Ligand binder design. Structure first.
Ligand SMILES: Nc1nc2c(ncn2[C@H]2C[C@H](O)[C@@H](COP(=O)(O)NP(=O)(O)OP(=O)(O)O)O2)c(=O)[nH]1
Ligand SMILES: [Mg+2]
Ligand SMILES: [Mg+2]
Length: 430
DNA sequence: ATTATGACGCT
DNA sequence: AGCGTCAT
């Protein structure tokens, strides 16, 4: 009753750039704008692998992970942009720099947590309180929410999508109690006003469009963001959770799309997030552990406590390359040469990071995959990173991995390597 | 022959 | 420390 916490204490948004790498290439090359187009890495094998797809191309069935030649079967007029190649590998610098453009704009409004190259959580609680004091009990006009959907509305007592959006928004705004400065629904609404402003600033100052979710925690904000894409934002209220979760497959919630979510489905014999409410917290803990069980018990009621961490910059800087099938590295000279290529890219990125961000990495992690292993990493070894020098980093990476070589011969490498991965970690202020 | 990352949990 | 999970 009155002591049951409802998880309505914060206003959290999740901003995700629409088809990011595509938008970056479309800004640079206007010929690609408003066209079916995709971004690929490499070219020789089946036209390259697609990693980003414009919404026009998605309409033809083009997806991430698809080979470009196969996508062209679905969409013969598909336009392609390729990721830059440097030192024999994909170089994603253009997209990292575009990411910084967007994250620096978002940081003007609130503290953000960089979740990926194109997404960030925003903790809007304090900004909402400030705006509410400015409003002085003034109602919120639908004009302030021109791209907002209210999940679950309209309901009750109409043909086109924009008319649906506006009907639901008007139902929502009509029911708002703007008298109460601590009303969670009001707070979410003001949060959505601020996110309209943030998204407008991003588009004005970069050209990039994005979608967003606004709710009371990170998981609901992330889920909300996906409900109306592209170039729209969605508000998920605490009250909308029972209906939303009643038909929501468990795998759609962040962290449940893998083995744990499958085990929830299999062990409990359920399909939808809402069905989890019928288990006690101890029952869920008995199946999935203390932490997961408590998290599931609260999350299926719309409640989650994970904070938006104050972190705009990535925690690691890494370089990796796969060597599939017949291109696997089978000689010592080969392994050394590719370690050097990776190390030279890493040195470039690390030196720029030190100048930009007043920090230095202190640990180098070396990960490899060997032929036949189905895992992502076959072996992971760390050493000290004491100087931003590519020849030194590559020699040290070789030194920590050289004992994996089964070959009695000094020149040969067996079993050949299907992936090399260098990662700079454990940053310190400088 | 999906690739290139990045965050984080467990022991 | 080194390995596994989730994501995309
Ligand atoms: N190198 C690499 N980059 C990837 C991969 N997957 C995604 N990216 C890059 C390319 C993506 O542009 C970017 C952001 O990833 P999303 O938010 O998951 N997809 P997007 O923003 O394209 O579409 P949406 O409108 O549905 O959000 O990350 C990958 O496997 N490898
Ligand atoms: Mg995106
Ligand atoms: Mg994203």
């Amino acid at each position: 009753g009155p002591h049951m916490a409802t998880g309505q204490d914060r206003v959290v948004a999740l901003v995700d750039m629409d088809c990011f790498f595509v938008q970056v290439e479309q800004r640079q090359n206007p010929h690609l704008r408003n066209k079916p187009c995709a971004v690929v890495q490499y070219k020789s094998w089946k036209g390259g692998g697609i990693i980003a797809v414009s919404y026009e191309a998605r309409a033809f069935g083009v997806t991430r992970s698809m080979w470009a030649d196969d996508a062209k079967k679905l969409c013969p007029d598909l336009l392609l942009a390729q990721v830059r190649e440097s030192r024999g590998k994909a170089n994603l610098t253009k997209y990292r720099e575009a990411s910084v453009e967007v994250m620096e704009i978002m940081s003007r409004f609130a503290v953000i947590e960089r979740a990926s190259i194109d997404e960030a959580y925003v903790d809007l609680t304090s900004a909402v309180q400030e705006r509410l004091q400015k409003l002085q009990g003034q109602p919120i006009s639908a004009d302030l929410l021109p791209s907002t959907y209210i999940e679950g509305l309209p309901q009750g007592p109409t043909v086109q999508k924009e008319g649906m959006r506006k009907q639901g928004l008007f139902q929502w705004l009509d029911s708002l109690q703007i008298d109460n400065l601590t009303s969670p629904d009001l707070q979410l609404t003001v949060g959505a006003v601020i996110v309209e402003e943030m998204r407008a600033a991003i588009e004005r100052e970069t050209g990039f469009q994005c979608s967003a979710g606004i709710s009371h925690n990170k998981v609901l904000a992330k889920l909300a963001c996906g409900l109306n894409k592209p170039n729209r934002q969605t508000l998920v209220s605490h009250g909308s959770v029972p209906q939303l979760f009643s038909q929501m497959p468990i795998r759609k919630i962040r962290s449940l799309g893998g083995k744990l979510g499958a085990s929830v489905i299999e062990i409990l014999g359920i399909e939808y997030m809402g069905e989890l409410t019928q288990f006690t917290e101890s029952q869920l803990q008995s199946h999935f552990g203390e932490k997961n069980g408590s998290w599931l018990y609260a999350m299926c009621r719309g409640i989650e406590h994970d904070p938006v961490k104050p972190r705009q910059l990535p925690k690691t800087i890494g370089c990796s390359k796969n060597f599939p099938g017949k291109t696997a590295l089978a000689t010592r000279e080969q392994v050394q040469w590719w370690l050097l290529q990776l190390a030279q890219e890493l040195e470039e990125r690390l030196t720029k990071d030190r100048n930009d961000n007043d920090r230095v990495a202190t640990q180098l992690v070396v990960s490899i995959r060997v032929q036949g292993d189905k895992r992502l990493s076959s072996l992971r070894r760390c050493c000290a990173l004491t100087r931003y020098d590519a020849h030194k980093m590559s020699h040290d990476a070789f030194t920590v991995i050289k004992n994996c070589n089964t070959s009695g011969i000094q020149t040969e490498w067996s079993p050949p390597l299907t992936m090399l991965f260098l990662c700079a970690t454990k940053f310190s202020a400088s």
